[PDB]
């Protein structure tokens, strides 16, 4: 994996954003790991989070004109990613976000939009933000999230896979389940988690 | 004024956030200038904005435990100010903001970020009325937290419906200090620096005479 991906995992771990154990997801699924970006709640967390998102964004090579952050979770993320791009990548990009109720804040919603969010659970918000992006004649360049759980949804494919299908766009993620596994495989003391995770992947993966 | 203040003024000018002319204010008055932080709509604008806010905050020397940004305007400002403090001042501070309604699917309520506790530094763009901070205050008080101060971009330093300015009501009503990066006084001092701004200096000085303080 890329250094920034490894750093993200270790940073998420230190902040208890990523926890290895046994947790019950809101789907009855017993997962051996939990991710909650909502725990990145201080200035330094935000600063670094913004750096990681910016890294994944620029590394993807996807062309976009503005960053859109869905209310409410997407707002601080879009904000920090925007400042990170400006300060560490010399890219001054327009940002925008909506009011849940004009219901828009920031620059004019125009061009190729890069939607920024934490995670795609059911795709609901994505589908909602999309009605807005389309309503303004803007197009979806891609979606940028923290972690791609790479696990089946209610059907055959995963939520990320549904979003990409329905919108002919790419979903970029800082890390995926494969990255977590690769990381665990290096930590001997994590053997139990590695077994649990790999087991979980076999049952609900891709 | 300090260098960071003059810099903010020029920053605002270049981004058309601060405009000198003749505008019919929301209150009905005809003002010689116009300020609209909403025009800080790009990544770099945000980056610099956060850095000016952080500067004024640290320079104030006021003690606070967390930054609170009111939905919706306060959210990006609180966010960038928080990152600016971390990145440029080595201060890792908890931030928090509200949702204008409770989250149906959950137990989080109407708060996002760290637990709303301690001395809160409310961050916003401008205070155009004493009634503006009420929503935030109810939330701060409902959580057993206290208001350390309010941080805004510009203090228009002009009367409202009464004899005092909106900022003066907030400080009085909540017994707190409102910090601003710049005030009307700073704009005037700046206009005196630029010989081309002579007509603007004239219009502004007169406006302050009729509505100032």
From Swiss-Prot, chain B:
UniProt catalytic activity: orotidine 5'-phosphate + diphosphate = orotate + 5-phospho-alpha-D-ribose 1-diphosphate
InterPro entries xrefs: OPRT, Or_phspho_trans_dom, PRibTrfase_dom, PRTase-like
Family statement drawn from the similarity comment of this UniProt entry: Belongs to the purine/pyrimidine phosphoribosyltransferase family. PyrE subfamily.
Chain positions recorded as 5-phospho-alpha-D-ribose 1-diphosphate binding sites: 26, 72-73, 99-100, 103, 105, 124-132
Co-factor(s): Mg(2+)
Pfam family, one: Pribosyltran
NCBIfam families tied to this protein: pyrE
Regulation: Inhibited by sulfate and phosphate ions.
GO CC, alphabetical: cytoplasm; cytosol
Name of the protein described by the UniProt record: Orotate phosphoribosyltransferase
Domain of life: Bacteria
Chain positions recorded as orotate binding sites: 34-35, 128, 156
GO MF annotations, alphabetized: magnesium ion binding; orotate phosphoribosyltransferase activity; protein homodimerization activity
Quaternary context: Homodimer.
EC number(s) reported in the record: 2.4.2.10
Gene3D superfamilies: 3.40.50.2020
Matching HAMAP family: PyrE
Functional note: Catalyzes the transfer of a ribosyl phosphate group from 5-phosphoribose 1-diphosphate to orotate, leading to the formation of orotidine monophosphate (OMP).
Annotated disulfide bonds: none
GO BP field: 'de novo' pyrimidine nucleobase biosynthetic process; 'de novo' UMP biosynthetic process; pyrimidine nucleotide biosynthetic process; pyrimidine ribonucleoside biosynthetic process
Pathway this chain belongs to: Pyrimidine metabolism; UMP biosynthesis via de novo pathway; UMP from orotate: step 1/2
């Amino acid at each position: 994996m890329k250094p920034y991906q490894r750093q993200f995992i270790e940073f998420a771990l230190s902040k208890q954003v990523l926890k290895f154990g046994e947790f019950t997801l809101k789907s009855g699924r017993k997962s051996p790991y939990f991710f909650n970006a909502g725990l990145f709640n201080t200035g330094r967390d935000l600063a670094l989070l913004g750096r990681f998102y910016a890294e994944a964004l620029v590394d993807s090579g996807i062309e976009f004109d503005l960053l859109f952050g869905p209310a409410y979770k997407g707002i601080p993320i879009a904000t920090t990613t925007a400042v990170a791009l400006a300060e560490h990548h010399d890219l001054d990009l327009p940002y925008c976000f909506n009011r849940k109720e004009g219901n828009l804040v920031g620059s004019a919603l125009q061009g190729r939009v890069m939607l920024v969010d934490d995670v795609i659970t059911a795709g609901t918000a994505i589908r909602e933000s999309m009605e807005i992006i389309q309503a303004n004649g803007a197009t979806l360049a891609g979606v940028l999230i923290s972690l791609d759980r790479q696990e089946r949804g209610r059907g055959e494919i995963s939520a990320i896979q549904e979003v990409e299908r329905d919108y002919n766009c790419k979903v970029i993620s800082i890390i995926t389940l494969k990255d977590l596994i690769a990381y665990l495989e290096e930590k001997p003391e994590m053997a139990e988690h590695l077994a649990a995770v790999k087991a979980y992947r076999e049952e609900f993966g891709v």
